[PDB]
C-alpha cells in the first residue's frame, strides 16, 4: 500500500507537489495516471520520471527512497482532477496503488 | 473520440480475449492500455505498445498492427471482466487522444 | 451488474434514443438515471422512476414497465452523447443494484 | 456554482460532515450522490433529505439557508468515495455542482 494525500490546492499557476510513500518505492517504478469521471484514465509519468506524447512538459517526476512524486508547475484548471501512483510489491509480483490525491485549483 | 474501440466484447472463461483500438497516428505513437473494475482504482496494463508494469499477469499482452492497437487477454478469468481504454497521442504527438472504451464480458 | 442494460445505444441527432434496464426488482424498487459526459461530474437526470430534478431539460424522460425501467431522450443533440446509468435496489430494499452502463452514441 | 470542500477525513466510526454552500440553495433541492471509479453513481439523499432504498440510515441530509450537508455517522472503508452535491441555479433553469469531497477513511 502506498500512502498519497487526500487532497492538494493551489492558486492558479502555483505548482502543485503531489508525494507517494511506500516501503517498495527504492526497488519498485512507480507511474502516474489523471483520473477524471467518464474519461479514459490519462498516463501522465511512466517508470518514474518518463513523459508520454501529448502530456505537457508541466507534470514531471521524480524519484528518492521511499517516495516518488509528481510535480505539475503552473497549474491550470483542466489539471483538476484526481492523480494517483501505481507501483508493485518488494517482490514485483502484485500491483499496489495510492488512495488518489485530488487536485483543487483555487 | 479520436481513437475507434467496440463498445463490447464477451468471452467464456478460458477463451482469449482481444480489444482493439483504431486510430491514424497509432503506427507512429505509443499505445497505453488500462483496466477498470467498479469501484476501484484504474490500472495500468500495458505502456508503450507492448509492456508490462511489474505485477501485471503475462496473459495480458499488447500489440501493434498498422492503425490498430490491440490488448490480447489470453486464458480470460471471471475477475477479468471490466472496463478497458486505450490511449495514445494524435499524428503530431501534440495532444492526447483516447477510445470510448469496450466492455469485457466474462460468460 | 444486478440490472441489464445493453452497452451501447446509437441514434442521429433529432431521433429520439430509448436506454433501458431490467431487472426482476424493478416493479418495487424506484429507479434514478445518470448522464455521464468525459471529464465532468456525473448528473442525475431522473430520481424515482420519472421525475427530474430542476435543470434537466423536459426532453429527458423516465418510464417503468414491468421489470423494465427506461430513459427516454427525445430530440437528441450531439452534446446528450455520454455514458448512462441505471441504479435502484433489490427485491427486498436492502441493498443497491446497477446496470454496466449504456454509451449513447449521436451519429 | 456550488462550494465544497476538496476532502474530509476521519478515523474509523467518526462521523463525516460534508457542506456545500451557494447563493441559491434557500431556494433550490440539493442531490447528493457517491462517486467511485468504475460503477455508476450511487444517489444517497435526493431533495435535501431524502434516502433512497438501498442506502445505509448513516447517510444523512440537511440543509439550512445557503448550505446543505451530508452526514455520514459511523463511517465505514467502503464509504471511501467523493461525494458531489447538485442542485440548480437561483431560476431552476439550469444544473449546477459543487467540486465534489474525497471522503478518506483513516
Ligand atoms: O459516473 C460514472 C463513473 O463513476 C464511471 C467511472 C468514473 C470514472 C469514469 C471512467 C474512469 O475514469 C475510467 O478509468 C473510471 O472512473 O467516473 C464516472
Known amino acids: 500500500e502506498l500512502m498519497q494525500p487526500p487532497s492538494v490546492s493551489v492558486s492558479p499557476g502555483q505548482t502543485a507537489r503531489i508525494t507517494c510513500?511506500?516501503?517498495?518505492?527504492?526497488?519498485?517504478?512507480?507511474?502516474?495516471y489523471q483520473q477524471k469521471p467518464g474519461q479514459a484514465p490519462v498516463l501522465v509519468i511512466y517508470?518514474?520520471?518518463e513523459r508520454p506524447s501529448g502530456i505537457p512538459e508541466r507534470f514531471s517526476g521524480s524519484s528518492s527512497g521511499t517516495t516518488v512524486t509528481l510535480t505539475i508547475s503552473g497549474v491550470q484548471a483542466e489539471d483538476e482532477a484526481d492523480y494517483y501512483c501505481?507501483?508493485?510489491?518488494?517482490?514485483?509480483?502484485?500491483?499496489?496503488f495510492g488512495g488518489g490525491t485530488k487536485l483543487v485549483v483555487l | 473520440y479520436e481513437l475507434m474501440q467496440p463498445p463490447s466484447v464477451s468471452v467464456s472463461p478460458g477463451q482469449t480475449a482481444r480489444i482493439t483500438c483504431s486510430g491514424d497516428?497509432?503506427?507512429?505513437?505509443?499505445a497505453y492500455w488500462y483496466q477498470q473494475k467498479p469501484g476501484q482504482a484504474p490500472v495500468l496494463?500495458?505502456?508503450?505498445?507492448?509492456?508490462?508494469?511489474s505485477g501485471i499477469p503475462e496473459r495480458f499482452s499488447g500489440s501493434s498492427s498498422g492503425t490498430t492497437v490491440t490488448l490480447t487477454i489470453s486464458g480470460v478469468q471471471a475477475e477479468d471482466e471490466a472496463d478497458?481504454?486505450?490511449?495514445?497521442?494524435?499524428?503530431?504527438?501534440?495532444?492526447?487522444?483516447?477510445?470510448?472504451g469496450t466492455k469485457l464480458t466474462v460468460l | 451488474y444486478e440490472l441489464m442494460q445493453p452497452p451501447s445505444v446509437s441514434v442521429s441527432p433529432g431521433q429520439t434514443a430509448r436506454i433501458t434496464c431490467?431487472?426482476?426488482?424493478?416493479?418495487?424498487?424506484?429507479?434514478?438515471?445518470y448522464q455521464q459526459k468525459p471529464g465532468q461530474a456525473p448528473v442525475l437526470?431522473?430520481?424515482?422512476?420519472?421525475?427530474?430534478?430542476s435543470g434537466i431539460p423536459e426532453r429527458f424522460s423516465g418510464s417503468s414497465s414491468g421489470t423494465t425501467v427506461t430513459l427516454t431522450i427525445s430530440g437528441v443533440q450531439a452534446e446528450d452523447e455520454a455514458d448512462?446509468?441505471?441504479?435502484?435496489?433489490?427485491?427486498?430494499?436492502?441493498?443497491?443494484?446497477?446496470?454496466?452502463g449504456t454509451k449513447l452514441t449521436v451519429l | 456554482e456550488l462550494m465544497q470542500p476538496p476532502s474530509v477525513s476521519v478515523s474509523p466510526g467518526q462521523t463525516a460532515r460534508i457542506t456545500c454552500?451557494?447563493?441559491?440553495?434557500?431556494?433550490?433541492?440539493?442531490?447528493?450522490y457517491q462517486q467511485k471509479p468504475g460503477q455508476a453513481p450511487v444517489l444517497?439523499?435526493?431533495?435535501?433529505?431524502?434516502?433512497?432504498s438501498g442506502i445505509p440510515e448513516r447517510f444523512s441530509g440537511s440543509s439550512s439557508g445557503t448550505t446543505v450537508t451530508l452526514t455520514i455517522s459511523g463511517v465505514q472503508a467502503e464509504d471511501e468515495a467523493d461525494?458531489?452535491?447538485?442542485?440548480?441555479?437561483?431560476?431552476?433553469?439550469?444544473?449546477?455542482?459543487?467540486?465534489g469531497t474525497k471522503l478518506t477513511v483513516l
Open positions: 517508470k518514474d520520471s
Open positions: 497516428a497509432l503506427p507512429k505513437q505509443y
Open positions: 501505481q507501483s508493485a510489491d518488494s517482490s514485483g509480483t502484485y500491483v499496489v
